[PDB]
Amino acid sequence: LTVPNIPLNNLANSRVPAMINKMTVSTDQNQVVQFQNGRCTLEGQLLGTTPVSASQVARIRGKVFSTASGKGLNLTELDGTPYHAFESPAPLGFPDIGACDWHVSTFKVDQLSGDPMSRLDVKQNAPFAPHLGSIEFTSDQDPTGDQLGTLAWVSPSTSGARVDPWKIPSYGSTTESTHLAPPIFPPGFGEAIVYFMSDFPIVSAQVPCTLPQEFVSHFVEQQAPVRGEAALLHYVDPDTHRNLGEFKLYPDGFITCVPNTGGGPQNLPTNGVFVFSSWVSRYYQLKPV
Amino acid sequence: QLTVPNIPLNNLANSRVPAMINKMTVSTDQNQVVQFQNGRCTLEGQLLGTTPVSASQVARIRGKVFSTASGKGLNLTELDGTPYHASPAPLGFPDIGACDWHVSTFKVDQNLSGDPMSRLDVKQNAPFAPHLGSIEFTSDQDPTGDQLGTLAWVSPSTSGARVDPWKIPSYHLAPPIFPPGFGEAIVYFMSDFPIVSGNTAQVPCTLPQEFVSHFVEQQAPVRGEAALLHYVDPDTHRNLGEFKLYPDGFITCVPNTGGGPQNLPTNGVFVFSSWVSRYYQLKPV
Ligand SMILES: CC(=O)N[C@@H]1[C@@H](O[C@@H]2O[C@@H](C)[C@@H](O)[C@@H](O)[C@@H]2O)[C@H](O[C@@H]2O[C@H](CO)[C@H](O)[C@H](O)[C@H]2O)[C@@H](CO)O[C@H]1O
Ligand SMILES: CC(=O)N[C@@H]1[C@@H](O[C@@H]2O[C@@H](C)[C@@H](O)[C@@H](O)[C@@H]2O)[C@H](O[C@@H]2O[C@H](CO)[C@H](O)[C@H](O)[C@H]2O)[C@@H](CO)O[C@H]1O
Known about the structure:
The structure is a homodimer. In chain A, about 50% of the residues are buried. Chain A is built from one helix and 14 strands, in the order E-E-E-E-E-E-E-E-E-E-H-E-E-E-E. The longest helix of chain A is centred in the last third of the chain and has 10 residues, at about 215-220. Chain A has one helix at about 215-220, and strands at about 20-25, 60-65, 70-75, 100-110, 115-120, 135, 145-155, 190-195, 195-200, 205-210, 230-235, 245-250, 255, 275-280. Chain A has two domains: about 1-55 and about 155-289, Nucleoplasmin-like/VP (viral coat and capsid proteins), CATH 2.40.510.10; about 55-155, Elongation Factor Tu (Ef-tu), domain 3 (Beta Barrel). Chain A is elongated, with a radius of gyration of 20 Å. By secondary structure, chain A is mainly β. Chains A and B meet through strand 4, strand 7 and helix 1 of A and strand 4, strand 7 and helix 1 of B. The structure holds a molecule of 3 linked components (NAG-FUC-GAL) (2 copies). The site of a molecule of 3 linked components (NAG-FUC-GAL) has 7 residues of chain B, from loops. Chain B: This is Major capsid protein.
């Protein structure tokens, strides 16, 4: 097993198209998340809506439809092939920033003149049910046909709400089975989930993810056998080659540390490289960072 | 030993625009020389031109707005906000030449309400001097401060002009790539992208972005004049075609007459086979 020999600041967020600019732990270290993107086991099994490439992250493709009530997209995978609702919550790469309005900038796939972009404004209201294969939108432009695009920004669902990018959508319409990647639980003994943060335009400031996207593709690519209960990593300064801290990478595909009281990995340099050290017991006792 | 990514072509990103690869092709004129500044990396992992490591750094721009009596523009920085020192441009800077760019940016600092996006409309005329650290733009919005964003679409420089995404800007340059050997054609990895010219509807690049990061990551020694690759169906394990990967960081094939790699399925995986001679003759594909 290896992890990417790439400094953290050259790694991409797995939940928005952006670069990671820092690590942190959640304010409440007992907080449980259930992100659907950035999810992959160490053996290379993609979970939830997680795609392989950073350029599949938080993107949408579909064919425009129009009814008496308004317009929407009948969803496909990002390559235009049929969406696998039977096994995933939404097309691979579909955004997972819950409980907010989305603004998605799309273009028509077969394109002679004029502004080609449409901004699709999507609400996560009662009828938002991407697992069933469609979403509705409003737009100040006139999108038609096969539209492909990327999440541009997010905003509050209602005037005066806030956006909490730590939430995920409700993919179903009702008891509807949506095939969610399971929750990630802080594993105990003072360990905290490490969140990789990126700047992103959130109107009412950073989006967390649990694996850098290149870690995901690395695991898919290697299909490495898991030879222990956890993988001990060192976070190494690439210029001085000093070990800046110990981290644990778990088979289910997330990373923890023991944050120093009043601190944590948010106080570490953001240009370090994670390096696999050894397979260890689930209860390997980390030095605080 | 040298390896290439164990990832099917349709899960690989373009290295010149933020998009996925959806086919391979050869140039209409198989003698055509290109000089792309992104997607450039040697097999040993040496980045060239403006090529960044991550797919989410491809064709992005960051800088501080200046807006004066004389004009508006960006004083460019690197994508992480650190100073750009006058390489052709900051890493990741777009390399789609001879066209207007439309770049959608947000204020990194922003703590205000409202539409956070600005579309920066950029022309490749006189004030376009990214090598010197600035470009000018017009915008129907009001961007201020530290703006970070991504190339959204491109359009003709002048009314009636066409956009040719095989061109690069006038900005250090990564060197031209000349079709090598006998009968070989450079393989171009294509992505759909909003180009508002004619029927063009595509972007070529010479290395998938994940190939670039793979080489940077691996730093493998070059042990021969060229690496023979097989393009393999990952389910049946059949070899679908022979390709040659050159140390300077590009791929060739010998296309069957009237055809070529554009006829191959896009779910195949490149696999290193062996080191071969610079004049190893490929099986037509
Ligand atoms: C005059 C009109 O009907 N539209 C103007 C835009 O031009 C149209 O859309 C552009 C993208 C091209 O497809 C034109 O052929 C078409 O008429 C014009 O858009 C600007 O076009 C410039 C070319 O002269 C250039 O590409 C520029 O980047 C682009 O923004 C806009 C902006 O001036 O004005 C419309 O009225
Ligand atoms: C000045 C004004 O009335 N602007 C309206 C937009 O609302 C502003 O910008 C949004 C993003 C929020 O920051 C508001 O607090 C601010 O007044 C409005 O934007 C829409 O806001 C909705 C929330 O009520 C929701 O987030 C929606 O997704 C977003 O588009 C736009 C669109 O209705 O209209 C402007 O006039």
